[PDB]
Amino acid sequence: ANIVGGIEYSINNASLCSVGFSVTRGATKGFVTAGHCGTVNATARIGGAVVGTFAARVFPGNDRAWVSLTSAQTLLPRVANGSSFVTVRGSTEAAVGAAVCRSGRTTGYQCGTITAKNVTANYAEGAVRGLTQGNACAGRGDSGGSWITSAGQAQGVMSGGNVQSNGNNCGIPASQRSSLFERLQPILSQYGLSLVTG
């Protein structure tokens, strides 16, 4: 499979999550995703084919993971936006007020702005601290997916939000949305990963 940010993958033939970003760790290919998507050694599949396994994760507290892929996988510096792509150029952290888009297998590509940083989410499992909030909408299934500026700067991976009974927060005004992502920079230094850029 061609690894693109925002595409669906399954965990142990049950849950679905979305790919965050292609990364490497020395000669190992991988992708960053959300921690709550799977446990260590869970098998990830893309299109019914095994692509790799969860190598590490932290959830709750933080919400981060990376899946080490087999060498058959093709890592690409891109995030899906409909049939088009956004190229990943680096990971400069944008500030509050900055515009940001996110990509995932349920709501697709959605944009909004960063409204707050260092938010705590109190999920059933425990609190996850230090999340950034934006008001781009998102749905169940979008977890793990890319948050990126149109300029190509990778921001982080989808954690969660104030999802309504229809499964997303797209049907409530932007003013009332709270979609939270885990910052990419701490995930990259914690696991010694380097972002694939183009």
């Binding site: 959300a34 709550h36 919400d63 989410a121 109190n122 999920y123 059933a124 499992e125 998102a138 749905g139 169940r140 299934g141 979008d142 977890s143 989808m158 954690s159 969660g160 939000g161 104030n162 999802v163 709270s178 939270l180």
Partner: peptide, 4 residues
């Protein structure tokens, strides 16, 4: 807020 919930995971996703």
């Amino acid at each position: 807020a919930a995971p996703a």
